[PDB]
Design a protein around this nucleic acid. Structure first.
Lengths: 52, 121, 233, 252, 68
RNA sequence: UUACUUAUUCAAUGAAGCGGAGCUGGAAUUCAUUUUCCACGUUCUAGCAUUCAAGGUCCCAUUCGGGGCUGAUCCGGGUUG
RNA sequence: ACUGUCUAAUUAAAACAUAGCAUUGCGAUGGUCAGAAAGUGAUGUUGACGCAAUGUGAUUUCUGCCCAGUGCUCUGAAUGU
């Protein structure tokens, strides 16, 4: 793998020759929805400290 | 005052100054001469009936060389003593424990011309 | 402001790998550091006898300043000073028919333990400064008591190194004054009165005080809060 | 006589443990600040067979609190855990199967396993397959916890010692007969060397205290005292009763 | 001189001052190596009467032997 | 008989958060007023967490950069039992 | 019971082993064992569904009475040695 060019050991994507386009796909789903839920989890506690 | 800030829990040895050697007298006071110079590298040509066939046909000089010499020192010794550029050198240790080198010369030099320049036919 | 955004980190446990803090409290020292620290610690936790405890009853900084100011006036002759005086007296005895006495009588501090102890036994020293730092303390534990026996006033002062500086040694561990110029007899008398008031008058009641037995601050905290939660309700 | 076999067991030449294929020492996380002040969350990445052992092991990866790296610990898989589960290790963690908690923070009757003896020795008790201890009570002053060990022996231990909730997987293993000398061979092939242990009564008087005679018999009492000597301890050491146990052994 | 006072004082090994020193020093010597270099004699007169003189090339080594 | 930790013994850790006090939070009841106790950033999810840390503030001589405090409470240097 | 093993060079067996059964020690400051010692080791990268010590020898059906003797063992006893 040191004699061949870069395009034999990669695909053109994030996580190219490491992950497999379906584990990359669920990685983007999971990163988006939890960090969006963390935006919900911030302000849903900002009503409990505003109403206690 | 105050004490210094340590961001690690490990103590390692300080990088102290280590001085170079400045002796009051020489190590052995006379440098040795060249242990494996060009007359000691190649000792003697090999003139057996099949070694003589390599001189005529193979463009190869069969030399007996020193047991300490490597292929760089034999490529440099043949070039020094005979002023001949060398293609490749193949060496073996003979079953009487001495070394034999198959020095191949380039195509510019005729090994049979150098063979009777050295003085063996 | 413009495109630079204040994003604070969350260094609570579970998130956001902790920043580099001062772990000098938790650094695994070399073995000589730990031995030299817990040696002091062990000499504090143990109940010390009163004839060792009298050291760390050291002289106060103002009186120490005055004492080293007086003792700087009688610093002994240095090596180049001895060379210049040896030339200026050897020529004098050889030609000027002197009896090796065209050099005046020196006034200097006396030092070295055998010299100073022999001067105290002869009742010849007028003041004795005693170091508190000496690592075999058996060299100097008899120096208070002997000074109380002989009527020589003595002061335990911080620094064998500071005693060594006044005498051009490295350390000297004791220093004495036996003869003093008459321009300094009053200052020597006031310093001796302060030193008697601090050391020699206090000796026969200091001689009974066992020192040490001082707990560490975790055990100190534990003991005080045990006293404050049990009794004080 | 000569040196008998269980005295050769301790010199450790061929009687050491056959430890090539082991995955590692099964251990809890060390008591750092997160484990005793709040919690921390790891992921179980793999449930894996460890040779020489009946229980499966679980690689659980954690985030290093002080350095940007990952730390993989090798727990014993409690029954029910699955790869991909989030495991919560710490004082203020929740009472779920898989979460390792200190014993002071669990109610009485909690079924934990891999429970420490001293707080910080990373897992000592209830550690073979199927086993578990029962937290039976707390003494909150001088803070201690009475638990019941798998042998039925009760034990008071520290309330800061940790343990993972649940019982250890692979249980009910020994209910299947081996049926073969081959299965006992391959069983002890990855543990040590004591499979074919010839009865001491069939040996010679050099080889054992039981050997010899024109019949195969022990000759003297097979119950040997505790204050006996290495070389004599062949039989039932310090046996306080013998014969078939009829009645409730089953200590209260 | 001081060496007579030290010579007599190192004979009272049951007195309080010497047993406190023996406890502190027997901890400290136990903390170091079995054979380790001593920078100076702890008994300077006992060393001195056994032949020691404080000049270069006279060396003190402390050493620890198992009893019994 | 039961207490101490400093001898001794055991254990863990690239000796990382120990001990004491504070800060706001609230349970909490005030016979004067705050006399005490618990907290004191993480739990749908097989993602992610690193460049003295961004920001707030003060210097340097503004060129690109560099430093101090804070962010991240103080105190004791007993690594923790 | 089987498959298996052993007396190389007079005995291959009904002997040994075996699974199965049972008993015992032991919760780590531990059981069993090693070393002349040790800041030393085996079991142990272990933890009672485990390690160690023995007896019996698949399955079916059972395993009776005796603790006086000799052992082992006990939260015991006491005014004997």
């Amino acid at each position: 793998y040191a004699t061949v060019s870069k395009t034999h050991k990669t695909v053109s994507r994030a996580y190219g020759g490491s992950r497999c386009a379906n584990c990359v796909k669920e990685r983007i789903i999971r990163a988006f929805l939890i960090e969006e839920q963390k935006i919900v989890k911030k302000v849903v506690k900002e009503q409990t400290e505003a109403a206690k | 005052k105050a004490l210094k800030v340590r961001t690690s829990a490990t103590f390692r040895l300080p990088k102290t100054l280590k001085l170079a050697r400045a002796p009051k007298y020489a190590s052995k006071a006379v440098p040795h001469y060249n242990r494996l110079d060009s007359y000691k590298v190649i000792e003697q040509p090999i003139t057996s009936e099949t070694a003589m066939k390599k001189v005529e046909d193979g463009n190869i000089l069969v030399f007996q060389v020193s047991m300490k010499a490597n292929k760089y020192q034999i490529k440099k010794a043949v070039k020094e003593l005979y002023e001949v550029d060398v293609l490749k050198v193949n060496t073996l240790v003979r079953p009487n424990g001495t070394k034999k080198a198959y020095v191949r010369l380039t195509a510019d030099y005729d090994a049979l011309d150098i063979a009777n320049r050295i003085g063996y036919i | 402001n413009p495109l630079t955004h204040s994003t604070p980190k969350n260094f609570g446990i579970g998130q956001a790998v902790q920043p580099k803090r001062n772990l000098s409290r938790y650094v695994k020292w070399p073995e000589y550091v730990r031995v030299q620290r817990q040696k002091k610690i062990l000499s504090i936790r143990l109940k010390v006898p009163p004839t060792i405890a009298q050291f760390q009853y050291t002289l106060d900084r103002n009186t120490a300043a005055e004492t080293f100011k007086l003792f700087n006036k009688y610093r002994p002759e240095t090596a180049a000073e001895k060379k210049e005086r040896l030339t200026k007296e050897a020529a004098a005895v050889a030609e000027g028919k002197s009896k090796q006495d065209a050099s005046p009588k020196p006034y200097a501090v006396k030092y070295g333990l055998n010299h100073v102890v022999a001067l105290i036994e002869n009742k010849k020293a007028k003041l004795v400064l005693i170091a508190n730092d000496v690592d075999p303390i058996e060299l100097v534990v008899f120096l208070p008591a002997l000074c109380k026996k002989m009527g020589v006033p003595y002061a335990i002062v911080k620094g064998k190194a500071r005693l060594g500086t006044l005498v051009n040694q490295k350390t000297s561990a004791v220093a004495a004054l036996t003869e003093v110029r008459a321009e300094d007899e009053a200052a020597l008398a006031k310093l001796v009165s302060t030193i008697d008031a601090n050391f020699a008058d206090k000796y026969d009641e200091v001689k009974k005080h066992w020192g040490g037995g001082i707990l560490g601050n975790k055990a100190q905290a534990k003991m005080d809060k045990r006293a404050k939660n049990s009794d004080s309700a | 006589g000569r040196v008998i076999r269980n005295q050769r067991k301790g010199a450790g030449s061929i009687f050491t443990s056959h430890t090539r294929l082991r995955q590692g020492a099964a251990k809890l996380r060390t008591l750092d600040y997160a484990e005793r002040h709040g919690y921390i969350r790891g992921i179980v990445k793999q449930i894996v067979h460890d040779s020489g052992r009946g229980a499966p092991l679980a690689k659980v990866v954690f985030r290093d609190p002080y350095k940007y790296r990952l730390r993989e610990e090798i727990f014993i898989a409690n029954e029910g855990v699955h790869t991909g589960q989030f495991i919560y290790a710490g004082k203020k963690a929740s009472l779920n199967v898989g979460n390792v908690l200190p014993l002071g923070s669990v109610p009485e009757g909690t079924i934990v396993s891999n429970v420490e003896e001293k707080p910080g020795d990373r897992g000592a008790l209830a550690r073979a397959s199927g086993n578990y201890v029962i937290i039976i009570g707390h003494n909150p002053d001088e803070n201690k916890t009475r638990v019941r060990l798998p042998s039925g022996a009760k034990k008071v231990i520290s309330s800061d010692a940790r343990g993972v909730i649940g019982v250890i997987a692979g249980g009910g293993r020994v209910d299947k007969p081996l049926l073969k000398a081959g299965r006992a061979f391959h069983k002890y092939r990855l543990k040590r060397n004591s499979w074919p242990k010839t009865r001491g009564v069939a040996m010679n008087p050099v080889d054992h205290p039981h050997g010899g005679g024109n019949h195969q018999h022990i000759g003297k009492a097979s119950t040997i005292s505790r204050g006996a000597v290495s070389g004599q301890k062949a039989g039932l050491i310090a046996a306080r009763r013998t014969g078939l146990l009829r009645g409730s052994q089953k200590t209260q | 001189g001081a060496y007579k006072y030290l010579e007599e004082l190192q004979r009272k090994k049951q007195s309080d001052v010497l047993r406190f020193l023996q406890r502190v020093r027997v901890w400290e010597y136990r903390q170091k190596n079995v054979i380790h270099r001593a920078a100076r004699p702890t008994r300077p007169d006992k060393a001195r009467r056994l032949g020691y003189k404080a000049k270069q090339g006279f060396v003190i080594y402390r050493v620890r032997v198992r009893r019994g």
